[PDB]
Amino acid sequence: MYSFPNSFRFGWSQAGFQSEMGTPGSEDPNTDWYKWVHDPENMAAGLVSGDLPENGPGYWGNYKTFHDNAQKMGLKIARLNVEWSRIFPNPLPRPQNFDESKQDVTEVEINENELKRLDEYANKDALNHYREIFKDLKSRGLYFILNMYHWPLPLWLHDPIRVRRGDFTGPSGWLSTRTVYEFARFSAYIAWKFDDLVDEYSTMNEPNVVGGLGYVGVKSGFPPGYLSFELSRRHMYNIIQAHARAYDGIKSVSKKPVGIIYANSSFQPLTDKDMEAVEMAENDNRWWFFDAIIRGEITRGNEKIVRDDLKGRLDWIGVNYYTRTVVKRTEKGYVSLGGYGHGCERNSVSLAGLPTSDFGWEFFPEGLYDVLTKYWNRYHLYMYVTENGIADDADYQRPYYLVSHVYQVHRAINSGADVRGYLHWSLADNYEWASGFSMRFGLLKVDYNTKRLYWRPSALVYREIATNGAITDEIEHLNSVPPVKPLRH
């Protein structure tokens, strides 16, 4: 048996854009992502699948069913976001005496009156619908992590097609301090409306992937698909500040924990000569960011300084994990290797003989122990596993994936790391961004014609885990690698 603390909670994570739409009445056409996946030219290029999110699993209407299934599955924690676009679909008037050309955003003044002024702009039907969703959630004894942001921005803050075309005269998303300013205020507003329901907060989900795939990994078909190292850096600088300002915003209205959710890889050495490459990869993809919002340490210009408005802006770390990245040392630095981690053939085997998912991601659960213990030893902040799952419509690999990753969290806790829950990605299949609906991550299969949910056998396995608070003796064999001999090579 692998028994978790009596306080540890098993549950799931879910995004607004990915799961809400699909039931008539749910449509939200006021985001960069909506416009981006409907773009005629993006569709002809193959940057997006042609699948549309309004044909989705319909959480907006069917949330009672999602929650029924979660309660039956014995789940005790949920993490979801509100969609900004839903709450403030229309442009807000530019602020008076805020200099849109200043690089730094060290304060956003928020009070009772700035909040009541916002009320005048807020979509009240959206607020009331979210309140109905969250109450039903709480009525099942589900502990509630509310996230403010999981990638789509209001169109009035980002027109991604204008930016793709090389036009920076329009709303430019995270490239603009206006977006930072409004993000702090949005976060404050949501905490002010929802803090009676909420247990813990996250500002953002994986802001590193928004900027990485948006401005460098442009084959991903992520908005705005404008290839620039420079704009990639500006995005990440503005998101650090947006996080700090959102923290202050929330803390002005709530005494509750405020964290962030971030995309992690376990960096692994190709040979025993590549350990320094692993540390350099960890500095570039992880520490640089967390040292900013925890220690206030940052590089502006070519100089290492401490910003007092950034220091101490984090109570907990949301660890999002799916696979490793293999790196080697170069003369000039380090490189990632294809044929491992996220860079594999779909439904095959990696260069190490490990099975790959429907998305071409290598099976490597020990990476999750690496990431949790490295965060713990550097910062000693408590963590949730806010995301872990696999694209696997057939359910061949998911039972092994689920039990193996849960074992590695048990291993981290046993090592001394404070990890308070495990949230699977995801309860049900959903819209996988530029890939569309083909990549199915759910414990529950979604028939998109009917919106009906079905229990994949891995859902029955997760119910064993969640209702016992343990990997039981009877399912312990699934702590192993899916046998590759019967799978595609």
Ligand X SMILES: *[C@H]1C(F)=C(CO)[C@@H](O)[C@H](O)[C@H]1O
**Other C-beta atoms within 10 Å of 333: how many?**
12
Continuous segment of H or E residues that includes residue 287: none
Residue 206 beta carbon to ligand X: minimum distance, rounded to whole angstroms: 5
User: How many CA atoms lie within 13 Å of 59's alpha carbon, on the beta-carbon side?
Assistant: 27
Closer to ligand X by Cβ: residue 226 or 322: 322
Non-local CB neighbours of 366 within 8 Å, separated by 6+ positions: 266, 408
Token pair of 21 as six digits: 């739409």
CB of 323 to ligand X, least distance (A): 9
Residues 367-406 contacting ligand X, CB under 6 A: 387
Cβ distance to ligand X smaller for residue 108 or 406: 406
Closest CB 312 distance from ligand X, rounded Å = 26
| CB nearer to ligand X: pick between 414 and 438 | 438
Q: Is 320 an interacting residue with respect to ligand X (CB under 6 A)?
A: yes
What token pair was written down for 17? 């854009």
Tell me the two tokens of residue 377: 């030893």
Using CB under 6 A, which of 144, 425, 437, 462 touches ligand X?
Answer: 425
Q: CA nearest 155: which of 236, 37, 234, 49?
A: 37
d(C-alpha 487, C-alpha 483), whole Å: 7
Sequence-ordered strand ranges (E) for 207-271: 258-269
User: Using CA atoms, how far apart are residues 322 and 426, in angstroms rounded to an integer?
Assistant: 12
DSSP letters spanning 343-411: SS-SSSB-TTS-BB-TTS-B--THHHHHHHHHHHHHH---EEEEE-----SS-SSHHHHHHHHHHHHHH
Both tokens of 251, joined, read: 């803390």
Q: Decide whether 81 or 176 has the Cβ nearer to ligand X.
A: 81
Residue of 20, 83, 206, 395 interacting with ligand X (CB under 6 A): 206
Residue with tokens 């997006």, as numbered in its chain: 48
Distance CA 240, CA 289 (A): 7
At 24, phi and psi to the nearest 5? -45, 135
CB of 432 to ligand X, least distance (A): 5
CB of 375 to ligand X, least distance (A): 17
List, in order, residues 6 or more apart from 101 with CB less than 8 Å away: none
Question: Which residues carry out catalysis?
Answer: 387
Residue span 229-258 as binding mask against ligand X, x where in contact by CB under 6 A, dash where not: ------------------------------
Q: Name beta bridge partners: 274.
A: none
Least distance from ligand X to the Cβ atom of residue 402, Å: 15
Options 28, 54, 429, 432; binder of ligand X; rule CB under 6 A: 432
- How many chain residues are in contact with ligand X, going by CB under 6 A? 9
Q: Residue 207 belongs to what H/E stretch?
A: helix 207-215
Would you tell me how many other CB atoms lie within 10 Å of the CB of residue 237? 22
Candidates 322, 363, 364, 422; binder of ligand X (CB under 6 A) is 322
Cβ closer to ligand X: 189 or 433? 433
Question: Two tokens at 168?
Answer: 């920076």
End-to-end distance of the chain based on CA atoms, in angstroms? 33
Residue closer to ligand X by CB (options 15, 161) is 15
**Least separation, in Å, of the C-beta of 396 and ligand X?**
18
Q: Among 62, 203, 205, 323, indicate the residue that binds ligand X (CB under 6 A).
A: 205
Least spacing, CB of residue 425 vs ligand X, in Å: 5
Least distance in angstroms from the C-beta of 407 to ligand X? 20
Distance of alpha carbon 398 from alpha carbon 375, whole angstroms: 26
Which residues, at least 6 apart from 167, have a Cβ–Cβ distance to it below 8 Å? none
CA atoms of 214 and 210, how far apart (whole Å): 6
What is d(CA 471, CA 464) in angstroms, rounded to the nearest whole number?
A: 8
Nearer to ligand X, 310 or 434 (CB): 434
Output the six-digit token pair for 281: 């990869």
Which residues make up the interface to ligand X (CB under 6 A)? 15, 18, 205-206, 320, 322, 387, 425, 432
